Symmetry: C3
Subunit: 238 residues, 3 copies
Amino acid sequence: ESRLDRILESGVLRVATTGDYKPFSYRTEEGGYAGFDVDMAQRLAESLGAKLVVVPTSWPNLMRDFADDRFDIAMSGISINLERQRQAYFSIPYLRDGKTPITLCSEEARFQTLEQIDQPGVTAIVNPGGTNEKFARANLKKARILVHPDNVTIFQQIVDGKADLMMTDAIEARLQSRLHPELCAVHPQQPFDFAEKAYLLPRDEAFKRYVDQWLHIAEQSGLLRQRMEHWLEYRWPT
Amino acid sequence: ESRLDRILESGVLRVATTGDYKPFSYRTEEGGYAGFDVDMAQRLAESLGAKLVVVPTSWPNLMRDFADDRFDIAMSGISINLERQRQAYFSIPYLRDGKTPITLCSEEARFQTLEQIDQPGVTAIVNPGGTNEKFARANLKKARILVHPDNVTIFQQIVDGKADLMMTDAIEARLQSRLHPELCAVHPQQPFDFAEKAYLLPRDEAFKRYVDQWLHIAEQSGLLRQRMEHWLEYRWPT
Amino acid sequence: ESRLDRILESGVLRVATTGDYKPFSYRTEEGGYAGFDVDMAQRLAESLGAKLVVVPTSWPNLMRDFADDRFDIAMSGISINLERQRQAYFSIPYLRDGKTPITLCSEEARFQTLEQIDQPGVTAIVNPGGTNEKFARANLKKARILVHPDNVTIFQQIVDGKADLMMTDAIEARLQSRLHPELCAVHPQQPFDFAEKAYLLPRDEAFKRYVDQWLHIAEQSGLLRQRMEHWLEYRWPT
């Protein structure tokens, strides 16, 4: 009665992914998938003699989808947080990060501190339902919060002047500062908070143990560092 | 069927504490509580949307109280040891330490090594029922062992000459060398053994996972280092 | 319903060991046992107030013996791998290592890389049923693979010219380069892969927790580093 045994008997691993967060997970117009976490899902599946079955989900529906048992694991640039820990498990962490501003490079100097960001005529854009929204709501008393449903296009909103900044994971701020030359990542090396990425798991001890063992070896063998570099350098569209 | 779910449905977290071990836990004459671990309990409770309910316990009764399910977690400068691990779980560790002497500063040079401590006319004082007593009994063949029930006043016994030394956690030896100017901590940086402080938990996987996740973030965010400093500098009475 | 409780009620710990892998586990002609992991088993048993009961097993039968519940733990220079993780748990790791060549010192320079090893007239010897065999089969397309059932005598096969090399854990390559002066360990410091040694455990959470707690203290107290040195320097026969 571990889903580790179910997966091993099945030969199927159901991996949920949002498809909306480069460099971790991106759903093409074709209807396939790329990125570091999709790449890693194929690896986890293989290690189990299993076929990778990609289950679409979204930031707003992640925990509903989780509660409903639509998937065995979620692999999608997911931050660890305690709200999520209330219901699910996380794997050991594969990345350390934190929220930081991305804004027009000209504006950069305005938005160094949350003191400067949280002001009556400032508009911070966020995608709904995840840690970006949570951070914005927890920390902005005075700035307006513009909820934009499509995270793939959220950075174009900043370019197009529809909002002054977004606070998002610094890895996403660094990459999008490359995909949209107008945008700058603000002190990505000194984020406003601490958070880790990990894989979202059922409350299942044996399956967490297997996943963590697989991830620890991927990490210590350097295979993890190398696939991330590959996906950071990859030719993402905009 | 995790007590994580019970606590979340309840809105109550029952935290056991001894109230007798500054800087971790101190029960006032009023009948309230202070210290690093009480401070941390409030934090754990909050993170869970729960009310902190402080359950009194003592070193002699800790494991009896634990077996009886009087509390959800114990947070009280508790050392990890295998005897305790027989019945309970521990969280990940928040402090590394070890047993070391505290004695009259004049006597300091007599009591550097266990060779010197363990002698026919030496009296080592300990509080009963915990790792201090266990260490003393495990390691003294020749010194007398004076069991003093009130750990709040045990250091005054050394000042008052009722015993020659105590071997206790070096963090408690450093602080009490400050609260009682007559006492010196002996090589606190080189303890006689290795031990960690952690929180005492039921055999409940999901609740340990939540607690460890919360503690790891408290630690990596530096919030842990900062509350300890605050409680080390606090104006404890004697 | 943890085997931690069964062992504590019993006063018995059943430890499986192969007896065929110095410096971890060696079964004498008398029919007793030596090595680092046997030494550690006595320690684990003691910590539990239990008697050590040594259960013989072998690389080919390890997982069959495990599935049949012939033992509570296996302690025998066992590598972590995911195949094994499918069915069992591992403790936290006590050693980091990797596969590397051991060959006649004269030949050393031929067998630096797997490019050089995997050639039509090369014969790599392995013992059956474990990670050495798995590695050899996974990585040799062109070299022949000679399966030798007795790991105690496998290194003498290289001395006797019956095979050109073995790829085995670098700790075993370093020690056998000492026991058989004709053999050299090839870049033991740069193995061909990454692997850890750990103890093989039932899917039992409370018992893993106890074991890991015991091992973490053995490690952090330096007791682990010191017993390994002792068994590396020990006067093994050949």
